[PDB]
């Protein structure tokens, strides 16, 4: 599924991401935009054996188990395929774990480079929340 901007914002708000650990909703929409272009089936297969899965491109080395990545920790305790659903619940719950386990939103390269220091409020502006 390829989400619309306001549709994703609404779903992320229902899952309680607005101000989660101090990060406004717009930050989460912006990160998903430049990580996956809002595509829930996005997959990026890397040369180190790992793969990035789903709308937030969560990496298989630490966070989910796909049975093919060395040194897997599966810290979100899910198969990576669960991150490729049209329902974003699994990706949101794992993302909450990623930010809270010390890292913050710096964990997402796309957020660090294309959202940090910008008017992230623009990504939810005009939407029905």
From Swiss-Prot:
<dbReference type="InterPro" id="IPR001916">
    <property type="entry name" value="Glyco_hydro_22"/>
</dbReference>
<comment type="function">
    <text>Lysozymes have primarily a bacteriolytic function; those in tissues and body fluids are associated with the monocyte-macrophage system and enhance the activity of immunoagents. Has bacteriolytic activity against M.luteus.</text>
</comment>
<feature type="disulfide bond">
    <location>
        <begin position="64"/>
        <end position="80"/>
    </location>
</feature>
<keyword id="KW-0081">Bacteriolytic enzyme</keyword>
<dbReference type="GO" id="GO:0005615">
    <property type="term" value="C:extracellular space"/>
</dbReference>
<dbReference type="GO" id="GO:0003796">
    <property type="term" value="F:lysozyme activity"/>
</dbReference>
<protein>
    <recommendedName>
        <fullName>Lysozyme C</fullName>
        <ecNumber>3.2.1.17</ecNumber>
    </recommendedName>
</protein>
<feature type="disulfide bond">
    <location>
        <begin position="6"/>
        <end position="127"/>
    </location>
</feature>
<dbReference type="GO" id="GO:0016998">
    <property type="term" value="P:cell wall macromolecule catabolic process"/>
</dbReference>
<dbReference type="InterPro" id="IPR000974">
    <property type="entry name" value="Glyco_hydro_22_lys"/>
</dbReference>
<keyword id="KW-0732">Signal</keyword>
<dbReference type="GO" id="GO:0050830">
    <property type="term" value="P:defense response to Gram-positive bacterium"/>
</dbReference>
<keyword id="KW-0326">Glycosidase</keyword>
<feature type="disulfide bond">
    <location>
        <begin position="30"/>
        <end position="115"/>
    </location>
</feature>
<dbReference type="InterPro" id="IPR023346">
    <property type="entry name" value="Lysozyme-like_dom_sf"/>
</dbReference>
<keyword id="KW-0020">Allergen</keyword>
<feature type="active site">
    <location>
        <position position="52"/>
    </location>
</feature>
<comment type="subunit">
    <text>Monomer.</text>
</comment>
<dbReference type="GO" id="GO:0050829">
    <property type="term" value="P:defense response to Gram-negative bacterium"/>
</dbReference>
<keyword id="KW-0378">Hydrolase</keyword>
<comment type="similarity">
    <text>Belongs to the glycosyl hydrolase 22 family.</text>
</comment>
<feature type="active site">
    <location>
        <position position="35"/>
    </location>
</feature>
<dbReference type="GO" id="GO:0016231">
    <property type="term" value="F:beta-N-acetylglucosaminidase activity"/>
</dbReference>
<dbReference type="GO" id="GO:0005737">
    <property type="term" value="C:cytoplasm"/>
</dbReference>
<keyword id="KW-0964">Secreted</keyword>
<feature type="binding site">
    <location>
        <position position="101"/>
    </location>
    <ligand>
        <name>substrate</name>
    </ligand>
</feature>
<dbReference type="InterPro" id="IPR019799">
    <property type="entry name" value="Glyco_hydro_22_CS"/>
</dbReference>
<keyword id="KW-0929">Antimicrobial</keyword>
<feature type="domain" description="C-type lysozyme">
    <location>
        <begin position="1"/>
        <end position="129"/>
    </location>
</feature>
<dbReference type="GO" id="GO:0042802">
    <property type="term" value="F:identical protein binding"/>
</dbReference>
<feature type="disulfide bond">
    <location>
        <begin position="76"/>
        <end position="94"/>
    </location>
</feature>
<keyword id="KW-1015">Disulfide bond</keyword>
<dbReference type="GO" id="GO:0042742">
    <property type="term" value="P:defense response to bacterium"/>
</dbReference>
<dbReference type="Pfam" id="PF00062">
    <property type="entry name" value="Lys"/>
</dbReference>
<dbReference type="GO" id="GO:0005783">
    <property type="term" value="C:endoplasmic reticulum"/>
</dbReference>
<dbReference type="GO" id="GO:0031640">
    <property type="term" value="P:killing of cells of another organism"/>
</dbReference>
């Amino acid at each position: 599924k390829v989400f619309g901007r306001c549709e994703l914002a609404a779903a992320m708000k229902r899952h309680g991401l607005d101000n989660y650990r101090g990060y406004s909703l717009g930050n989460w929409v912006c990160a998903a935009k430049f990580e996956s272009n809002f595509n829930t089936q996005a997959t990026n297969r890397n040369t180190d054996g790992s793969t990035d899965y789903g709308i937030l491109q969560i990496n298989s080395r630490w966070w989910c188990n796909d049975g093919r990545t060395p040194g897997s920790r599966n810290l979100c305790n899910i198969p990576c395929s669960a991150l490729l659903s049209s329902d974003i619940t699994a990706s949101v719950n794992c993302a909450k774990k990623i930010v809270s386990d010390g890292n913050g939103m710096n964990a997402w390269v796309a957020w660090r480079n294309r959202c940090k220091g910008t008017d992230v409020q623009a990504w939810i502006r005009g939407c029905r929340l």
